[PDB]
């Protein structure tokens, strides 16, 4: 709303850049975290059966 | 309180050198503009020189360009001006003056003014005055006032006060300004206008003083035959 | 204005409780240079401070 587009495009694509490089933070580290909830799911049906 | 306090004037014989002070008081003369500006006998003003603080940003009027010298004062704050070879011409009261042109858009006027001083080109001496009454005519009768008086002739330099019988009579007393004789030497004439009936019981005593010369004279003046 | 500070004791005016129309001051190409950072000089009348 306050800078034209040729120049509010270098601000949108920092915070882009910040923004995307955090979500895949968070990905990453939830597909670690699934991997070792599967883990223990596993390990529960296994105690189960 | 804003005080600029002249000083350094004075006679000089033409192509002499002479160096004036104005002393500042009360404010910060360090961050002000300071200016001279003179003023020929009778004439109209007429700017000298400014200096705007920097020992170089210093500027003269064309009448005065390379034959007088601006420069300013620390510490003590005072100003000075140096008058080189100078002409029967550049006889003025020479007056310094303020100024803060520097930020203020606003003042850019002459804020105070001082008083000025006296600055005379000549080869003429120092010299006392000389006094001689003015004597009325005894038949006079066209009116119940005579007029009398005191001329203080060949004085240098100003000023001059008068007074009269010590101060007891003091009633119509009218000073004259000075003037300039083609001789080199001024001129001044004291008067009072009086009845003329108490011309030959009242004794008429006209005191001049003269403060350079110290100079006290009591003269009576008598009605002819 | 008439005169203007000098650079060394430049002068500064407040503004506040008043409505700025900057379209027609920008809109008058009377002016040598207009940088603006930190916001366009354009679409400024769509913003407040």
């Known amino acids: 709303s306050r800078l034209d587009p040729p120049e509010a495009e270098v601000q949108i694509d920092r915070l882009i850049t910040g923004r995307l490089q955090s979500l895949q933070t968070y990905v990453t580290q939830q597909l670690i975290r699934a991997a070792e909830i599967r883990a223990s799911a596993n390990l529960a049906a296994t105690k189960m059966s | 309180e804003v005080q600029l306090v002249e000083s350094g004037g004075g006679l000089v014989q033409p192509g002499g050198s002479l160096r004036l002070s104005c002393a500042a008081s009360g404010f910060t003369f360090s961050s002000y503009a300071m200016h001279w500006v003179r003023q020929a006998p009778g004439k109209g003003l007429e700017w000298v020189s400014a200096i705007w603080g920097s020992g170089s940003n210093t500027y003269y009027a064309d009448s005065v360009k390379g034959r007088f010298t601006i420069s300013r004062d620390n510490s003590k704050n005072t100003l000075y001006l140096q008058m080189n070879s100078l002409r029967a011409e550049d006889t003025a009261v020479y007056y310094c003056?303020?100024?803060?042109?520097?930020?203020?858009?606003?003042?850019?006027?002459?804020?105070?003014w001082g008083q000025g001083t006296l600055v005379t080109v000549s080869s003429a001496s120092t010299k006392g005055p000389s006094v001689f009454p003015l004597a009325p005519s005894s038949k006079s009768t066209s009116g119940g006032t005579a007029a009398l008086g005191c001329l203080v002739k060949d004085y240098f330099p100003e000023p001059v006060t008068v007074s009269w019988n010590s101060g007891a009579l003091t009633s119509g007393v009218h000073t004259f300004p000075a003037v300039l004789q083609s001789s080199g030497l001024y001129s001044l004439s004291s008067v009072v206008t009086v009845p003329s009936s108490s011309l030959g019981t009242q004794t008429y005593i006209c005191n001049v003083n003269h403060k350079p010369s110290n100079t006290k004279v009591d003269k009576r003046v008598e009605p002819k035959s | 204005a008439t005169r203007f500070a000098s650079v060394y004791a430049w002068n500064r005016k407040r503004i506040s409780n008043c409505v700025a129309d900057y379209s027609v001051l920008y809109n008058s190409a009377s002016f040598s240079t207009f940088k603006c950072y930190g916001v366009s000089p354009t679409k400024l009348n769509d913003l407040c401070f």
């Open positions: 003056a303020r100024g803060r042109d520097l930020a203020a858009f606003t003042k850019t006027a002459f804020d105070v």
